[PDB]
Structures are given as C-alpha cells and as structure tokens.
Amino acid sequence: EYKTVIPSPYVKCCGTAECKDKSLPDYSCKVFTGVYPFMWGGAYCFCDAENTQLSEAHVEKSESCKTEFASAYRAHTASASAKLRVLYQGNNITVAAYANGDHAVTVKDAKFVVGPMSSAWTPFDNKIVVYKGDVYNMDYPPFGAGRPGQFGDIQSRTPESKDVYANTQLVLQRPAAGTVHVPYSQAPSGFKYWLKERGASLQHTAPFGCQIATNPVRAVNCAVGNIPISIDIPDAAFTRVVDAPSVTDMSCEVPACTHSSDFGGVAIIKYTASKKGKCAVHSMTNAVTIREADVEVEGNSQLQISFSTALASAEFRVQVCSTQVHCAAACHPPKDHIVNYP
C-alpha cells in the first residue's frame, strides 16, 4: 500500500503562484483563482477574487511495507528432496536426500541413491505471487507498467529501496468555495483491493494436492511418476544360505479372506524347518502384498500371515526360505465403499 503526501496548500492574495516541476513519482500540481477561503476568525484575506491557490501532491511507499507486502517472483525450475524409512536388520531407519539422482547418502554401512524424479511436472508456474503465507499462480504486469486498481499498481524493487514507480492519475480539483482545504483525486489502491479478491490459494488448486509451505516455498506430498533407488548393501548383512534354517513340508490354507484396502486376508501355513532361525517371506505376484517381511521359524510348526489383495479369488505363490507354497482362496466384498487412509 502507498501513502499520499499532500503538504499544506499554498495560498496567496492579489498575486499568483506557479507550478515548478518536481522529480517525484506521480507528482502533480494545480492552481485555481477566485477562491475566497474563510477560517474560524473570519476571511483569510481581503482580495475578493484576485487571490490564488496552488496545490500539489505526490505518492510514496508506506513504512508498513517493511512488515506487510506481496512479492512477485519468476520461479522456473525446482529441485527435489525426500525422506525415506527403510526396514534394515529388523529396525526402521530414516534417510534424507535430494531426489534428483545425484545425492548419495551413507547409513549403517550402506549407500543409498535416490532419484532422479521420473516426472518433471510441477504445480508451480514461471511467475508466482506470494503473500505472507499464501502463494498464487498469476501473471503479474511487467514492472513499470502497473495498471491502477490492480495488482502491481505500485512497484518497488525491494522493501527498503527508496526508488519506486507509481501510476495513480493524481488529479486535483477546485476547492470548495468558502473553505480552505486541498481536494485530491487519489486513485484507489489496487494492492489492498487485490487482497480482497485473492481467490483460491494454490494449496487447493494444485493438481495432485502438493502441499505448499513458505520460508522457503516448497511443494510437498504430491504423487506423480516414480522414483529409482540404488542401494549398495555390504555383504555383512547378507547371510549364506547354509546359515538359514531349511524348510520342508509346506502347506497353505485360508480360513477366510476379504479383498479390501486393509490386510483383510489371513493365511495359515504349516511348515517344518531344520532349526530355529529368521527367514524372509515374500509374494512374487504384484497383485497381492504381504504386510510382514520376515518371521522366526522353529521347525515342525505353523504360522499366520496377514496380506492384502484385490482379486475376487486369490490364487498365488508365496516364497519363504527359498521355497514356494501355493495358496488358493475365495475372498468376499467388504461392506464399506470408501475409506480415509490411503
């Protein structure tokens, strides 16, 4: 917002004033004749119509700008950073890295590399305008061509730079007869107004709902494309096959299953193993997923596993201790049609 400075008008009697140009933004001046102002104690002066009035005004930046303002940037490209959680050696570990295929991060003797982002799509735009805590995709007018009553009506290079540019059609008018005062046709401030018609923020208009923050401005949590990850894992974690207990006498059964967004499937497997030990479990068909990663096996015992599927009839193999076991079942539709968690 801008402040309009209009010092005390110059009054004169029996003589005439004159306009001297001022090298100030949107500075304007005018003169009038025949005005006969009156004050509390009576007429200012005697000259009935020979008197004259000179007025002038200009517009400057407001000190409030140092605290409140709207800033227009021309952000074009972006970089990606991401946070990952990895189950390693039976514990959750957090990693942070730039998701552009360059940053490499060492953790627990293993080297992780993430990115680059498959999709270059962004929710932002070449030109953006930011308020205190809001961001807007909007093509601001070019500097020095602000249209009055609209965003950019006053342009400043920086909040502290003294130089400014303005366009406000500051036209004066003849003062009311019998009174001493200065009228001004100051243009209404388009900046304050734009705050009134800002519209929807980009945190709602962004496709894929990429949450937007500030200081710094980032777009976060939007699902687009995929990520490549390369992990160099030292052999220390690796265990020779002989170390792992063997497995035999594999049987599978499904007392019931329910294709749903949750782990609605339960499978009971009878197994026999050489010795007590951990053993990984996996499903080699992408159509089905298993919540569990590994499990301890003692020998001729059984175990239960919770899994999620989408097939009406679930017919799949399961891998454990380098062995395959079939599993066939007929799931049923649940009752709910929509869920909150993803």
Partner 1 sequence: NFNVYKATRPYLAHCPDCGEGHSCHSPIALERIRNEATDGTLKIQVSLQIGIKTDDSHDWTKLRYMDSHTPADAERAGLLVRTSAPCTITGTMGHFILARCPKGETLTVGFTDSRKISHTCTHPFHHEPPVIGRERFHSRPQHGKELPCSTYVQSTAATAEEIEVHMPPDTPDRTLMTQQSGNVKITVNGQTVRYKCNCGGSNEGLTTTDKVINNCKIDQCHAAVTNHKNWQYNSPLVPRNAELGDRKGKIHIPFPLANVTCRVPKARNPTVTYGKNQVTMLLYPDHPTLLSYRNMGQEPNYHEEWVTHKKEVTLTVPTEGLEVTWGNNEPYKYWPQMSTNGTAHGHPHEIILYYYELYPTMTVVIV
Ligand X SMILES: *[C@@H]1O[C@H](CO)[C@@H](O)[C@H](O)[C@H]1NC(C)=O
The yes or no reply on residue 94 touching ligand X (CB under 6 A) is no
In the shown chain, the binding pattern of residues 123 to 142 toward partner 1, with x for contact by CB under 8 A and - for none, equals: ---------xx---------
Stretch (H or E) spanning 1: none
Binding piece for partner 1, criterion CB under 8 A, among 59-67, 77-85, 268-276, 289-297: 59-67
Amino acid, res. 304: Q
Q: Which two tokens stand for residue 254?
A: 């499904």
Name the residue nearer to partner 1 (CB basis): 120 or 339: 339
The yes or no reply on residue 67 touching partner 1 (CB under 8 A) is yes
Binding-site partner at residue 195 among partner 1, ligand X, none, CB < 5 to 8 Å by type: partner 1
Q: Which two tokens stand for residue 99?
A: 């998701």
Other Cβ atoms closer than 10 A to 68: 12
The yes or no reply on residue 67 touching ligand X (CB under 6 A) is yes
Binding-site partner at residue 92 among partner 1, ligand X, none, CB < 5 to 8 Å by type: ligand X
Name the residue nearer to partner 1 (CB basis): 223 or 242: 223
Query: Can you tell me the distance from the alpha carbon of 93 to that of 86, in angstroms, rounded to the nearest whole number?
Result: 5
Name the residue nearer to partner 1 (CB basis): 176 or 233: 176
CA atoms in the 13 A half-sphere facing the CB of 256: 6
The single residue among 92, 94, 221, 226 that binds ligand X, judged by CB under 6 A, is 92
The yes or no reply on residue 74 touching partner 1 (CB under 8 A) is no
The yes or no reply on residue 58 touching partner 1 (CB under 8 A) is no
Q: Which two tokens stand for residue 169?
A: 């059609």
Name the residue nearer to partner 1 (CB basis): 214 or 300: 214
What is the DSSP secondary structure assignment for residue 221, as one 8-state letter? -
The yes or no reply on residue 51 touching partner 1 (CB under 8 A) is no
The yes or no reply on residue 161 touching ligand X (CB under 6 A) is no
Q: How far is CA 95 from CA 84, 89, 91, 155, 221, in A?
A: 5, 15, 13, 44, 17
Burial class (CB in 10 A: 0-12, 13-18, 19+), 275: exposed
Query: Can you tell me the distance from the alpha carbon of 202 to that of 138, in angstroms, rounded to the nearest whole number?
Result: 10
Query: Sign of torsion, CA 43 49 51 54?
Result: positive
Q: How far is CA 219 from CA 80, 121, 213, 276, in A?
A: 9, 12, 7, 48
* Interface contacts to ligand X, rule CB under 6 A: 67, 87, 90-92
* Interface contacts to partner 1, rule CB under 8 A: 1, 6-12, 37, 39-46, 62-64, 66-68, 132-133, 147-149, 169, 171, 173, 175-176, 179-183, 185, 187-188, 192-193, 195-196, 200, 204-209, 224, 259-261, 312-313, 330, 332-340, 342
